[PDB]
Amino acid sequence: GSIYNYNGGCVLGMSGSNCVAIACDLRLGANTFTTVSTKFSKIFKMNNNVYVGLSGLATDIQTLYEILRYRVNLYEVRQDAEMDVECFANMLSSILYSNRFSPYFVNPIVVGFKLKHYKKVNYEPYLTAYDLIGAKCETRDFVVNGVTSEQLFGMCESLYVKDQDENGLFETISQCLLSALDRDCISGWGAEVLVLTPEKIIKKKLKARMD
Amino acid sequence: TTICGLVCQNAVILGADTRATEGPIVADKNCSKLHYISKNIWCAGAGVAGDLEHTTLWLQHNVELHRLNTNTQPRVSMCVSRLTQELFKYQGYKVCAIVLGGVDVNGPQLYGIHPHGSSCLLPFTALGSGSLNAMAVLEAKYRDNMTIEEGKNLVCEAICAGIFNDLGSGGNVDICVITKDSYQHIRPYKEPNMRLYHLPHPTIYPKGTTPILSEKIEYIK
């Protein structure tokens, strides 16, 4: 717990009607109370339909991201195809458990699209959350992780609305993240929100508190 | 330390070694471990020397006060009660293992008292770090109704066993024979250890060999 408090940070993920959203706080901390950066993004793109939000110790976040990028790139170059979101989620679970007795201090979420072929292709929102040793929670509405987990859980339980367009989804996720961050000492200093749609990605920086 | 006691016919014989040790170093070569409580009661001590000395002095003077007030002969049972109650009050933090022997209306009596405040009435006993060697000798050779001379020889043998087999025991053998009418405290009784090598002549330093900075002489009046 102290190791997570060292840096802080929080990630959130929500689903709408034919869209998903992944949000994060932009702070980098030190000694649990010193802010050294305000542009430390915690959302990483694996491919067009897969994003991972990593919160926790910053060094472990960077290490896990490098490992995941390595694995995804090798898989995709070998198969000549984009990696499936479920396959990436299972691979992340197995990688996290491979360090079971000396784990990475990272609490990740996976947000993306599952592609189903029939002619056209159906995009299904996909959300999973993890604990540091790869225990996986597959969800249809929202996933949270980080030191702000309780606040995010409360906000999402109270405010999440099913089957929202991209605009309503963005408003809901931004409000949840901002209200949850306003109650955390070691999280905040800016919020980054990505809204995924099958044809485009909207990246927004929120006017947030910086105290 | 090796202290011991036994009951022979109409007498109680206590014996002790005479070594006090501060870690691996002998702090005292001829310390006295047998203490007079009253004319008919004596004790031998093992454990922390300061505790033993203070407690034995306190018991002696309280017993003398009681004797003066009651105008009767002191009782080994009274000494046992006082000592055990004190030791129990302090919960073994006064490290005093005592062999208390005396003769009163109930005849010769020997008690072993332990630091936590337990006591036992015994025909013979031994305490200290040499207690196991002394106990070996006593178990081998003790019998009821021994003569005073036989008891003295046995106590000497037990204390010598302790002295020569335990590293915390040494010096001489002190003995005390207590009857209903007198006590005989023989100190030393054996004297079995002496320095074995001496230089041909003692080293006398020539006068003025030590350099001095200043010398002030004052006259005592």
Partner: protein
């Protein structure tokens, strides 16, 4: 403790450190030179911590980067250098940790002037201004307040003078001797400042 300060502008990077070599309650030297590690191709690693770990890690990184540049007949990018340093520190964190804080400064055409902040836990991020040590608490707000975009080298040096004055006045360790490395106009300059 060793105070390190770093400032990144659009046209420069300035690194600053105290010049004390400390052994218990005595200062071995007032002109210590074991904190800056200059790497060919406009790169600098400023290290703070125990002198032994500082020397070992700094020389290890410098020799590895020089080997890379000789083998490939090319200059390593500043981002590659920073993340290589972070990867090595992270690798050794769980085996035999170096207790060193890093300020990684450099210049390259691809990304211009770059400054990276890294702590002994190997938590790294690119910053416009950073600090390490117990003097960070006293210089970080000065950097925040007086930093602006389009700052010049001389204005940055004035900010550093404010920082040094604060460290002399209010810091428990009255630090008066500082060394500065300035990267700008594709040249690296050394300065010594006493307050």
């Amino acid at each position: 403790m060793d105070t390190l300060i770093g400032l990144r502008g659009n046209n420069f990077v300035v690194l600053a450190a105290d010049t004390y070599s400390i052994n218990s309650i005595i200062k071995l030297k007032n002109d210590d030179n074991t904190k800056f590690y200059d790497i060919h191709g406009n790169k600098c690693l400023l290290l703070g911590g125990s002198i032994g770990d500082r020397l070992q890690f700094g020389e290890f990184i410098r020799k590895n980067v020089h080997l890379y540049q000789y083998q490939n007949n090319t200059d390593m990018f500043v981002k590659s250098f920073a993340f290589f340093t972070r990867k090595n520190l992270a690798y050794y964190l769980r085996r035999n940790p170096f207790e060193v804080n890093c300020l990684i400064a450099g210049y390259d055409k691809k990304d211009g002037y770059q400054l990276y902040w890294c702590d002994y836990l190997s938590n790294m991020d690119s910053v416009n201004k950073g600090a390490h040590g117990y003097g960070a608490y006293l210089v970080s707000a000065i950097l925040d307040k007086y930093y602006h975009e389009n700052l010049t080298v001389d204005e940055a040096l004035d900010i550093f003078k404010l920082c040094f004055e604060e460290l002399k006045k209010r810091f428990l360790l009255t630090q008066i001797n500082y060394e500065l490395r300035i990267m700008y106009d594709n040249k690296v300059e050394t300065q010594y400042v006493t307050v």
